[PDB]
Every structure is written in C-alpha cells, then in structure tokens.
Design brief:
The protein is mainly beta and about 130 residues long. The protein has one domain. It has no helices and 11 strands. It has strands at about 5-10, 15, 20-30, 40-45, 50-60, 65, 75-80, 85-90, 100-105, 125, 130-134. The chain is globular, with a radius of gyration of 14 Å. It binds zinc ion (ZN). Zinc ion binds next to loops. Zinc ion binds near residues 108 and 115.
C-alpha cells in the first residue's frame, strides 16, 4: 500500500499446447496494517483484445478467484514467508497466449472478497509473455 512498491515477475515463456508454464510475482516494499490484508494475482492481455483477470488470491486467508476459462487447469498459490504468489498453468491452450501482468490492490479488511476487477488494482508489474503454439 506503500509508494516504493515494486512487483517483480518471473517465469513465462512459450510451450506447445497441452504443456505447462509457471509465473511468479513478489510484492516488495508493500507495507500494511495488522488489521488489513490485500489481494494479488494476474491479468492477461492478447493482441487487440481487452485485458482480463486470470486468477487472484487474498493474502492471509488464501481466498481465490479463477476466470471460468482457466478453472481446472490453473492454480494460484501464495507463499506467506517468501512474499511471493505463483500461478501454475497446466493443459495450456492457444486461447491462453497473452502478456500476463502481476497486480496487487490497496489493503482493506479481511471481510472483503478477493478482488478480480482490473479497476480494483493499483500496483502493476511490467508484464511477462506467454505463448502456446499449435
Ligand atoms: Zn483485494
């Protein structure tokens, strides 16, 4: 919720359909209240298409959101201690090709559901390319 926050992404690449990839992201320097929590996840954008939310996790209570397109293939997990989130993407399809952006929102109560709208996220990573060939 800090100002010199940096989201650091890792992973990505290109694979043939059916294979798997993993993304990772670290929210460095984000300071926040013991009475609050916040959400982290990935949006993706394909060329000429609107960005869309992929999967998100609320820190602390591990609540998750997955877009219907990825349920059963994608898994988002959080490492409390290493301050990272990661996204395991199995059975990848051509429709999954995109730039995937890590994101985090301003801190808020645990009572709020994990956030998944692009307008609800204020910190963004630079992007990591994902390509699934035929
Ligand atoms: Zn949130």
């Amino acid at each position: 919720d800090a100002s010199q926050v940096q989201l650091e992404e890792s992973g990505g690449g290109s694979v043939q359909a059916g294979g798997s990839l993993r993304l990772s992201c670290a929210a460095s320097g984000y300071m926040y209240s013991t009475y609050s929590t916040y959400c982290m996840g990935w949006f993706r954008q394909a060329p000429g298409k609107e960005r869309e939310g992929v999967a998100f996790i609320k820190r602390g209570d591990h609540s998750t959101y997955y877009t219907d397109s990825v349920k059963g293939r994608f898994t988002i997990s959080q490492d409390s201690a290493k301050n990272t989130v990661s996204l395991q993407m199995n059975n990848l399809k051509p429709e999954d090709t995109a730039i995937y952006y890590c994101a985090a929102d301003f801190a808020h109560s645990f009572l709020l559901s994990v956030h998944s709208g692009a307008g609800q996220y204020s910190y963004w990573g630079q992007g990591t390319q994902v390509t699934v060939s035929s």
